Amino acid sequence: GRQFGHLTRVRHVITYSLSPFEQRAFPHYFSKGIPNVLRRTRACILRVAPPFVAFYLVYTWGTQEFEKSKRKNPA
Amino acid sequence: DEDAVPTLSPCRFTGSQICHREDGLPLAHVAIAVEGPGWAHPDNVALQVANAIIGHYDCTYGGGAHLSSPLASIAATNKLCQSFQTFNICYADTGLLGAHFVCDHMSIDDMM
Protein backbone atom coordinates (compact mmCIF):
# COMPACT_ATOMS: atom_id res chain seq x y z
CA GLY A 1 0.00 0.00 0.00
CA ARG A 2 0.42 3.73 0.60
CA GLN A 3 0.92 5.37 -3.04
CA PHE A 4 1.72 8.99 -3.69
CA GLY A 5 -0.94 11.56 -3.25
CA HIS A 6 -2.36 9.75 -0.23
CA LEU A 7 0.67 9.95 2.05
CA THR A 8 0.06 12.96 4.22
CA ARG A 9 -1.02 16.68 4.33
CA VAL A 10 1.70 19.30 3.78
CA ARG A 11 1.37 23.06 3.52
CA HIS A 12 3.50 26.02 2.34
CA VAL A 13 6.85 24.45 1.62
CA ILE A 14 8.67 25.32 -1.55
CA THR A 15 11.34 23.04 -3.05
CA TYR A 16 13.81 24.22 -5.60
CA SER A 17 15.66 21.54 -7.61
CA LEU A 18 18.10 21.58 -10.43
CA SER A 19 18.43 19.06 -13.19
CA PRO A 20 21.22 16.41 -12.78
CA PHE A 21 22.66 17.36 -16.15
CA GLU A 22 23.30 20.87 -14.88
CA GLN A 23 25.20 20.25 -11.72
CA ARG A 24 28.19 18.31 -10.58
CA ALA A 25 27.88 14.90 -8.97
CA PHE A 26 30.99 15.62 -6.92
CA PRO A 27 30.99 19.32 -5.89
CA HIS A 28 33.40 20.28 -3.07
CA TYR A 29 34.10 16.47 -2.66
CA PHE A 30 37.39 16.69 -0.94
CA SER A 31 36.90 20.31 0.16
CA LYS A 32 33.56 20.07 2.01
CA GLY A 33 33.61 16.28 2.10
CA ILE A 34 36.51 15.33 4.38
CA PRO A 35 35.73 17.79 7.28
CA ASN A 36 32.30 16.18 7.35
CA VAL A 37 33.66 12.69 7.79
CA LEU A 38 35.88 14.00 10.60
CA ARG A 39 32.86 15.68 12.26
CA ARG A 40 30.79 12.50 12.00
CA THR A 41 33.60 10.50 13.46
CA ARG A 42 33.94 12.99 16.40
CA ALA A 43 30.26 12.76 17.11
CA CYS A 44 30.28 9.03 17.26
CA ILE A 45 33.66 7.79 18.67
CA LEU A 46 32.79 8.09 22.33
CA ARG A 47 29.85 5.82 21.76
CA VAL A 48 31.26 3.38 19.23
CA ALA A 49 34.97 3.16 20.15
CA PRO A 50 35.03 2.28 23.91
CA PRO A 51 32.99 -1.00 23.87
CA PHE A 52 35.29 -2.25 21.20
CA VAL A 53 38.54 -1.46 22.96
CA ALA A 54 37.12 -3.13 26.02
CA PHE A 55 36.99 -6.29 23.86
CA TYR A 56 40.34 -5.46 22.19
CA LEU A 57 41.94 -5.51 25.60
CA VAL A 58 39.96 -8.56 26.85
CA TYR A 59 41.18 -10.34 23.68
CA THR A 60 44.94 -9.80 24.08
CA TRP A 61 44.86 -10.35 27.81
CA GLY A 62 42.72 -13.47 27.31
CA THR A 63 45.23 -14.98 24.97
CA GLN A 64 48.33 -14.16 27.08
CA GLU A 65 46.97 -15.86 30.20
CA PHE A 66 46.05 -18.90 28.12
CA GLU A 67 49.49 -19.24 26.47
CA LYS A 68 51.42 -18.37 29.58
CA SER A 69 49.42 -20.94 31.59
CA LYS A 70 50.54 -23.99 29.63
CA ARG A 71 54.00 -23.50 31.10
CA LYS A 72 55.36 -23.83 34.71
CA ASN A 73 58.47 -23.76 36.88
CA PRO A 74 58.57 -25.85 40.23
CA ALA A 75 56.06 -28.38 41.70
CA ASP B 1 20.51 59.08 -28.12
CA GLU B 2 24.34 58.72 -27.85
CA ASP B 3 25.88 56.96 -24.82
CA ALA B 4 23.67 55.11 -22.24
CA VAL B 5 21.81 52.95 -24.80
CA PRO B 6 22.54 49.26 -24.09
CA THR B 7 21.25 46.18 -25.84
CA LEU B 8 19.73 43.01 -24.34
CA SER B 9 21.92 40.24 -23.02
CA PRO B 10 20.83 36.65 -23.67
CA CYS B 11 19.21 34.75 -20.82
CA ARG B 12 20.45 31.37 -19.86
CA PHE B 13 17.72 28.75 -19.71
CA THR B 14 18.34 26.39 -16.84
CA GLY B 15 15.84 23.64 -16.54
CA SER B 16 14.99 22.73 -13.09
CA GLN B 17 11.94 22.59 -10.92
CA ILE B 18 10.08 24.60 -8.33
CA CYS B 19 7.33 22.95 -6.36
CA HIS B 20 5.09 24.92 -4.06
CA ARG B 21 3.33 22.23 -2.05
CA GLU B 22 -0.01 23.46 -0.64
CA ASP B 23 -2.66 20.87 0.13
CA GLY B 24 -5.11 23.50 1.09
CA LEU B 25 -5.84 24.34 -2.55
CA PRO B 26 -8.18 21.86 -4.26
CA LEU B 27 -6.53 21.49 -7.76
CA ALA B 28 -2.90 21.22 -8.75
CA HIS B 29 -1.42 23.45 -11.26
CA VAL B 30 1.64 22.37 -13.20
CA ALA B 31 3.59 24.04 -16.03
CA ILE B 32 6.37 22.25 -17.85
CA ALA B 33 8.45 23.53 -20.78
CA VAL B 34 11.69 23.15 -22.69
CA GLU B 35 13.61 26.11 -23.98
CA GLY B 36 12.26 27.35 -27.22
CA PRO B 37 13.96 29.61 -29.73
CA GLY B 38 13.17 33.31 -29.86
CA TRP B 39 10.75 35.36 -32.02
CA ALA B 40 12.97 35.54 -35.04
CA HIS B 41 13.50 31.78 -35.57
CA PRO B 42 11.70 30.24 -38.52
CA ASP B 43 10.96 27.03 -36.67
CA ASN B 44 8.18 28.56 -34.55
CA VAL B 45 5.72 27.68 -37.23
CA ALA B 46 6.43 23.92 -36.97
CA LEU B 47 6.35 24.16 -33.19
CA GLN B 48 2.93 25.74 -33.37
CA VAL B 49 1.73 23.05 -35.73
CA ALA B 50 2.93 20.41 -33.30
CA ASN B 51 1.36 22.30 -30.42
CA ALA B 52 -1.93 22.60 -32.30
CA ILE B 53 -2.04 18.79 -32.79
CA ILE B 54 -1.72 18.37 -29.04
CA GLY B 55 -4.16 21.28 -28.73
CA HIS B 56 -6.04 22.22 -25.60
CA TYR B 57 -8.77 20.94 -23.43
CA ASP B 58 -11.11 22.17 -20.76
CA CYS B 59 -13.97 20.47 -18.90
CA THR B 60 -16.69 22.43 -20.81
CA TYR B 61 -15.67 21.42 -24.37
CA GLY B 62 -18.38 19.48 -26.02
CA GLY B 63 -17.15 16.30 -27.67
CA GLY B 64 -15.01 14.35 -25.29
CA ALA B 65 -13.91 10.94 -26.30
CA HIS B 66 -14.06 11.82 -29.98
CA LEU B 67 -11.65 14.81 -29.92
CA SER B 68 -8.75 14.40 -32.40
CA SER B 69 -5.96 15.19 -29.99
CA PRO B 70 -5.03 11.97 -28.19
CA LEU B 71 -4.16 13.90 -24.98
CA ALA B 72 -7.47 15.69 -25.09
CA SER B 73 -9.30 12.51 -25.77
CA ILE B 74 -7.62 10.44 -23.10
CA ALA B 75 -8.01 13.33 -20.69
CA ALA B 76 -11.70 13.67 -21.20
CA THR B 77 -12.56 9.96 -21.10
CA ASN B 78 -10.50 9.00 -18.10
CA LYS B 79 -11.09 12.50 -16.59
CA LEU B 80 -7.39 13.05 -16.00
CA CYS B 81 -7.69 16.80 -15.78
CA GLN B 82 -9.88 19.82 -15.66
CA SER B 83 -8.08 21.75 -18.34
CA PHE B 84 -4.71 21.80 -20.16
CA GLN B 85 -3.12 24.01 -22.77
CA THR B 86 0.03 23.88 -24.83
CA PHE B 87 2.02 27.10 -25.29
CA ASN B 88 4.98 28.48 -27.24
CA ILE B 89 6.05 31.68 -25.48
CA CYS B 90 8.63 33.83 -27.31
CA TYR B 91 11.26 36.32 -26.08
CA ALA B 92 14.39 37.81 -27.80
CA ASP B 93 16.50 34.68 -28.40
CA THR B 94 14.85 32.16 -26.16
CA GLY B 95 11.40 30.92 -25.06
CA LEU B 96 9.30 28.50 -23.04
CA LEU B 97 7.73 25.71 -25.10
CA GLY B 98 5.46 23.21 -23.50
CA ALA B 99 2.13 22.83 -21.71
CA HIS B 100 0.21 23.69 -18.52
CA PHE B 101 -2.61 21.77 -16.83
CA VAL B 102 -4.91 21.68 -13.89
CA CYS B 103 -6.18 18.61 -12.10
CA ASP B 104 -7.13 16.60 -9.06
CA HIS B 105 -4.31 15.51 -6.77
CA MET B 106 -4.40 11.89 -7.97
CA SER B 107 -4.07 12.69 -11.67
CA ILE B 108 -0.85 14.62 -11.89
CA ASP B 109 1.18 11.51 -12.76
CA ASP B 110 -1.11 10.04 -15.48
CA MET B 111 -1.57 13.55 -16.87
CA MET B 112 2.16 14.03 -17.16
Word description of this protein:
The longest helix of chain A has 37 residues, at 33-69. By secondary structure, chain A is mainly alpha-helical. In chain A, 49% of the residues lie in helices and 11% in strands. With 112 residues, chain B is α+β, with helices and mostly antiparallel strands. Chain B contains 3 helices and 5 strands, in the order ββαβαββα. Chain B has a 4-stranded antiparallel beta sheet, with helices on one face. In chain B, strand 4 (83-90) and strand 5 (95-103) form a beta hairpin. The radius of gyration of chain B is 18 Å and the shape is globular. Classes of the chains: A mainly alpha (75), B alpha+beta (112). The A-B interface holds A 4-6, 9-19, 21-22 and B 14-24, 105-106, 108-109. Strand 1 of chain A pairs antiparallel with strand 1 (16-22) of chain B, so a sheet runs across the interface.
Topology:
The structure is cut from a larger assembly and holds chains A (75 residues) and B (112 residues).
Chain A: E1 11-18, H1 33-69
Chain B: E1 16-22, E2 28-36, H1 44-54, E3 56-58, H2 70-77, E4 83-90, E5 95-103, H3 108-111
Antiparallel strand pairs in B: 2-5, 3-4, 4-5
Modified residues (N6-acetyllysine) (chain A): 32
Pfam families (chain A): UcrQ (PF02939)
Function (chain A): Component of the ubiquinol-cytochrome c oxidoreductase, a multisubunit transmembrane complex that is part of the mitochondrial electron transport chain which drives oxidative phosphorylation.
